[PDB]
Design an enzyme around this catalytic site. Structure first.
Site, PDB file in Angstrom:
ATOM      1  N   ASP B  21      15.260 -43.322 -23.881  1.00 19.43           N
ATOM      2  CA  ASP B  21      15.040 -41.880 -23.617  1.00 19.43           C
ATOM      3  C   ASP B  21      13.883 -41.367 -24.413  1.00 19.43           C
ATOM      4  O   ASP B  21      13.765 -40.134 -24.599  1.00 19.43           O
ATOM      5  CB  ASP B  21      16.282 -41.020 -23.911  1.00 19.43           C
ATOM      6  CG  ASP B  21      16.865 -41.282 -25.332  1.00 19.43           C
ATOM      7  OD1 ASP B  21      16.182 -41.892 -26.219  1.00 19.43           O
ATOM      8  OD2 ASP B  21      18.082 -40.982 -25.504  1.00 19.43           O
ATOM      9  N   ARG B  35      10.504 -37.063 -26.144  1.00 14.47           N
ATOM     10  CA  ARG B  35      11.932 -37.249 -25.915  1.00 14.47           C
ATOM     11  C   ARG B  35      12.246 -36.668 -24.511  1.00 14.47           C
ATOM     12  O   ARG B  35      11.821 -35.538 -24.180  1.00 14.47           O
ATOM     13  CB  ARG B  35      12.681 -36.446 -26.996  1.00 14.47           C
ATOM     14  CG  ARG B  35      14.230 -36.441 -26.763  1.00 14.47           C
ATOM     15  CD  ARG B  35      14.779 -37.915 -26.865  1.00 14.47           C
ATOM     16  NE  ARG B  35      16.263 -37.945 -26.958  1.00 14.47           N
ATOM     17  CZ  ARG B  35      17.104 -37.810 -25.944  1.00 14.47           C
ATOM     18  NH1 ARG B  35      16.634 -37.523 -24.694  1.00 14.47           N
ATOM     19  NH2 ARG B  35      18.443 -37.852 -26.216  1.00 14.47           N
ATOM     20  N   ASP B  40      20.468 -38.779 -22.202  1.00 16.71           N
ATOM     21  CA  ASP B  40      20.695 -39.550 -23.425  1.00 16.71           C
ATOM     22  C   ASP B  40      20.966 -40.993 -23.057  1.00 16.71           C
ATOM     23  O   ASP B  40      22.026 -41.308 -22.445  1.00 16.71           O
ATOM     24  CB  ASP B  40      21.879 -38.918 -24.190  1.00 16.71           C
ATOM     25  CG  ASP B  40      22.025 -39.442 -25.625  1.00 16.71           C
ATOM     26  OD1 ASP B  40      21.065 -39.969 -26.168  1.00 16.71           O
ATOM     27  OD2 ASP B  40      23.109 -39.286 -26.211  1.00 16.71           O
ATOM     28  N   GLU B  43      22.228 -45.789 -28.199  1.00 13.56           N
ATOM     29  CA  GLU B  43      21.494 -46.389 -29.284  1.00 13.56           C
ATOM     30  C   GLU B  43      21.281 -47.889 -29.053  1.00 13.56           C
ATOM     31  O   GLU B  43      21.989 -48.538 -28.274  1.00 13.56           O
ATOM     32  CB  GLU B  43      22.278 -46.233 -30.585  1.00 13.56           C
ATOM     33  CG  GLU B  43      22.405 -44.815 -31.108  1.00 13.56           C
ATOM     34  CD  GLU B  43      21.033 -44.207 -31.464  1.00 13.56           C
ATOM     35  OE1 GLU B  43      20.312 -44.757 -32.304  1.00 13.56           O
ATOM     36  OE2 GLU B  43      20.696 -43.173 -30.909  1.00 13.56           O
ATOM     37  N   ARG B  81       9.428 -34.140 -31.701  1.00 14.80           N
ATOM     38  CA  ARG B  81       9.096 -34.885 -30.467  1.00 14.80           C
ATOM     39  C   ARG B  81       8.800 -33.922 -29.322  1.00 14.80           C
ATOM     40  O   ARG B  81       9.461 -32.857 -29.189  1.00 14.80           O
ATOM     41  CB  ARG B  81      10.321 -35.724 -30.073  1.00 14.80           C
ATOM     42  CG  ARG B  81      10.666 -36.659 -31.275  1.00 14.80           C
ATOM     43  CD  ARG B  81      11.814 -37.582 -30.912  1.00 14.80           C
ATOM     44  NE  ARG B  81      13.075 -36.821 -30.711  1.00 14.80           N
ATOM     45  CZ  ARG B  81      14.287 -37.381 -30.555  1.00 14.80           C
ATOM     46  NH1 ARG B  81      14.460 -38.713 -30.611  1.00 14.80           N
ATOM     47  NH2 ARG B  81      15.341 -36.607 -30.281  1.00 14.80           N
TER      48      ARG B  81
HETATM   49  C1  LIG Z   1      16.985 -34.148 -25.702  1.00 17.56           C
HETATM   50  C2  LIG Z   1      17.080 -33.226 -26.867  1.00 17.56           C
HETATM   51  C3  LIG Z   1      17.497 -33.750 -28.098  1.00 17.56           C
HETATM   52  N1  LIG Z   1      17.492 -32.901 -29.188  1.00 17.56           N
HETATM   53  C4  LIG Z   1      18.050 -33.347 -30.483  1.00 17.56           C
HETATM   54  C5  LIG Z   1      19.582 -33.193 -30.465  1.00 17.56           C
HETATM   55  C6  LIG Z   1      20.045 -34.328 -31.444  1.00 17.56           C
HETATM   56  O1  LIG Z   1      19.786 -33.957 -32.812  1.00 17.56           O
HETATM   57  P1  LIG Z   1      21.052 -33.450 -33.761  1.00 17.56           P
HETATM   58  O2  LIG Z   1      22.137 -34.584 -33.626  1.00 17.56           O
HETATM   59  O3  LIG Z   1      20.382 -33.284 -35.158  1.00 17.56           O
HETATM   60  O4  LIG Z   1      21.501 -32.161 -33.178  1.00 17.56           O
HETATM   61  C7  LIG Z   1      18.973 -35.425 -31.153  1.00 17.56           C
HETATM   62  C8  LIG Z   1      19.450 -36.496 -30.156  1.00 17.56           C
HETATM   63  O5  LIG Z   1      18.294 -37.280 -29.852  1.00 17.56           O
HETATM   64  P2  LIG Z   1      18.414 -38.901 -29.758  1.00 17.56           P
HETATM   65  O6  LIG Z   1      19.363 -39.218 -28.568  1.00 17.56           O
HETATM   66  O7  LIG Z   1      16.957 -39.346 -29.527  1.00 17.56           O
HETATM   67  O8  LIG Z   1      18.944 -39.438 -31.072  1.00 17.56           O
HETATM   68  O9  LIG Z   1      17.817 -34.759 -30.603  1.00 17.56           O
HETATM   69  C9  LIG Z   1      17.046 -31.615 -29.055  1.00 17.56           C
HETATM   70  O10 LIG Z   1      17.042 -30.863 -30.037  1.00 17.56           O
HETATM   71  N2  LIG Z   1      16.574 -31.125 -27.874  1.00 17.56           N
HETATM   72  C10 LIG Z   1      16.597 -31.884 -26.760  1.00 17.56           C
HETATM   73  O11 LIG Z   1      16.236 -31.392 -25.680  1.00 17.56           O
HETATM   74 CA   LIG Z   2      19.638 -41.397 -27.334  1.00 11.98          CA
END
Ligand SMILES: Cc1cn([C@H]2C[C@H](OP(=O)(O)O)[C@@H](COP(=O)(O)O)O2)c(=O)[nH]c1=O
Ligand SMILES: [Ca+2]
Ligand SMILES: Cc1cn([C@H]2C[C@H](OP(=O)(O)O)[C@@H](COP(=O)(O)O)O2)c(=O)[nH]c1=O
Ligand SMILES: [Ca+2]
Lengths: 135, 135
Positions: B21, B35, B40, B43, B81
């Site tokens: 993703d 991102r 999602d 991992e 990102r």
């Molecule tokens: C897709 C997306 C993820 N995120 C944040 C939420 C999660 O952080 P928090 O857990 O600190 O809230 C994290 C998940 O991304 P990853 O799936 O890349 O790990 O990215 C956003 O803030 N906005 C978005 O649109």
């Molecule tokens: Ca992810």
């Protein structure tokens, strides 16, 4: 108004490939950058630079198995890069680049020149065929 | 002795692909990590994590043209990102991942949910076909 909610697509491109005489690999648990022994590909902004980068990426990307072979001397250069011959399914990347006229034989240092004559032979053949750098 | 001068090949592997993703791209002169909106992927160490990374790499690597499409809201997340829908020759990566059961629809935030129903439709179809995450 619903008409103003549409989105719009914009151009993007891949990030620039690294120079063709370098390759990033995981070796014994460690990501590191290897600089290919005994060769030099042109810079990105020089003739054949992007073609050499593309060639090495193609070799690395298609390989079922990649192997690293250090020489008898220093395992790293003064920039902290690993110094090795790199093989992709048994085919040496350093030799292929030279064989195609995408790298010259270069940076010959004591203790790390086991494949010097092999690579010089490949270079002579690239020159005879007037390939790329030699055209 | 000449017998002790031979070299030896050792294993190496590619560096771990980034999560499916996310995609690194050059956008208006800037390398950056995007991102993918509304999805999602698992991992690396979770079921389907490596398959999702492989899928996105395949889409990005084969594309003749890549495009980025921001939504109406924030252009970046709290990790710095870029937040976008990414297209590879007109095919949305975010939708394909969901359509194959390699990502769930997730992280739905106000102002950045233009393609929410489109992606929910793709997810329903992946679930109906019991693909990957839904198997
Ligand atoms: C897709 C997306 C993820 N995120 C944040 C939420 C999660 O952080 P928090 O857990 O600190 O809230 C994290 C998940 O991304 P990853 O799936 O890349 O790990 O990215 C956003 O803030 N906005 C978005 O649109
Ligand atoms: Ca992810
Ligand atoms: C291949 C090789 C390069 N190098 C150094 C020489 C050049 O640095 P100096 O110009 O500071 O001497 C540089 C060229 O690498 P690049 O072709 O990657 O730029 O890398 C080594 O020290 N040992 C080697 O075996
Ligand atoms: Ca060089």
């Amino acid at each position: 108004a619903t008409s103003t909610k549409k989105l719009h697509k914009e151009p993007a491109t891949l990030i620039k490939a690294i120079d063709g005489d370098t390759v990033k690999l995981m070796y014994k648990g460690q990501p590191m950058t290897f600089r290919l022994l005994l060769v030099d590909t042109p810079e990105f902004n020089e003739k054949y630079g992007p073609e050499a980068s593309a060639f090495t990426k193609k070799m690395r990307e298609n390989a079922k198995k990649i192997e690293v072979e250090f020489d008898k001397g220093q395992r790293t250069d003064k920039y902290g890069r690993g110094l090795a011959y790199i093989y992709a399914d048994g085919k040496m990347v350093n030799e292929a680049l030279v064989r195609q006229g995408l790298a010259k034989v270069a940076y010959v240092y004591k203790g790390n020149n086991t494949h010097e004559q092999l690579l010089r032979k490949a270079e002579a053949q690239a020159k005879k065929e007037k390939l790329n750098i030699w055209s």
